[PDB]
């Protein structure tokens, strides 16, 4: 963090929060790990030091230039911004895992309880802005620089990791990207409506697809919005979807060839690739190994 964010570029007030980040996430992580215990149900709850890596991975994917541009763009002090980014990435790692809505509201307490005490200098300006109810979400695709006039003629949109203040401002952008997917992929239509909770799930997926060396696992009862939001996130993210075709002829040998085509696309030539799986696509347990 001290290497990636240098004193030279930042204010003295911003950099006092950057030094706080590294001490803050640990205080939070100890509180969250002590309270949310693994059980027969809610087995995944156990928090490792992968879940520390993953917080910081998110924080360091927000560039020095978007933090310094928070007073113009987000219309908040850049030192204040930085706490919102922290709060977001802390939530996305820790709070998203959590299976029920009561366990979330406990953890949103710990993320606020820590953010006040770690960031004492901006305590009164954090406390008033940042709630669990109020949204301050992050996405690479916020920028509408992709006009899409006879394909992508106007360069591309720089995929910079920026904060969105309201879900309504995002919905206009996310509804536009949905309508454009249905144009580009006309054979497989995707009639979908982006309610506040689905938008939130799309960002969460289009974060996990956008971070390097970051797989996902979308756990939902079924018909929950998983596959549809994934293919949209993969479309928005300008990366190649791959899905296993289940036929009686197709076996564990043909999987290995479908994975090999994945590495032929990913490791060779250098294309981002987003191998998609479901309960249905897992014909036998050996495929999942």
């Amino acid at each position: 963090i001290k290497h990636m964010f240098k004193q030279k570029y930042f204010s003295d007030s911003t950099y006092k929060v950057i030094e706080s980040l590294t001490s803050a996430t640990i205080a939070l992580w100890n509180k969250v790990k002590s309270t949310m215990l693994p059980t027969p149900a809610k087995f995944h709850y156990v928090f490792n030091m992968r879940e520390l890596s993953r917080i910081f991975k998110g924080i360091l994917t927000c560039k020095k230039d978007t933090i310094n541009d928070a007073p113009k763009s987000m219309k908040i002090k850049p030192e204040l911004f930085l706490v919102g980014l922290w709060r977001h990435e802390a939530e996305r790692v820790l709070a998203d895992k959590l299976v029920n809505n009561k366990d979330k509201d406990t953890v949103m307490g710990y993320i606020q309880e820590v953010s006040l005490e770690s960031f004492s200098q901006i305590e009164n300006e954090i406390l008033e802005k940042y709630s669990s109810e109020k949204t301050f979400l992050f996405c690479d695709f916020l920028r509408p620089d992709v006009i899409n006039e006879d394909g992508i003629i106007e360069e591309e949109a720089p995929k910079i990791y920026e904060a969105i203040d309201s879900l309504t401002e995002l919905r206009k952008r996310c509804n536009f990207l949905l309508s454009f997917y249905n144009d580009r992929n006309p054979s497989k239509k995707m009639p979908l409506v982006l309610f506040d909770d689905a938008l939130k799930h799309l960002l969460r997926i289009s974060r996990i697809i956008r971070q390097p060396r970051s797989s996902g696992l979308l756990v939902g009862v079924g018909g929950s919005g998983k596959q549809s939001l994934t293919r949209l996130a993969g479309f928005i993210g300008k990366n190649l979807i791959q899905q296993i075709i289940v036929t009686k002829t197709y076996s564990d040998k043909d999987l290995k060839e479908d994975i090999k085509k994945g590495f032929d696309d990913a490791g060779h030539l250098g294309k981002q690739v987003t191998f998609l799986m479901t309960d249905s696509e897992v014909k036998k347990e050996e495929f999942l190994e």
């Binding site: 409506v193 309610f195 506040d196 909770d197 009862v221 079924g222």
Partner: protein
Amino acid sequence: EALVSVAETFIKNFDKLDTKEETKQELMKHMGNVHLMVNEICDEYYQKMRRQVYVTPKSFLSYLNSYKTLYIEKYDELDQQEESFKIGLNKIQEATI
């Protein structure tokens, strides 16, 4: 807010649904408030009778469809009656004068 937001898009797609714009906004909320009320009873039914009924977001998309199919059909019967009535009420009124 999700179920009501899904119910909002479905009523807009529904062109043959003829009612007040106020009433449609009350219906949107009701459609959603139904799908919660079933989940609330599904939990109650497991505590009182030890029977597990599972309702998913797919089972809400089924309700909304099923709603239109029975409405469209039931409106088609009613609307063609009211039109066979209304042809009457004009010609008879003229005959009375």
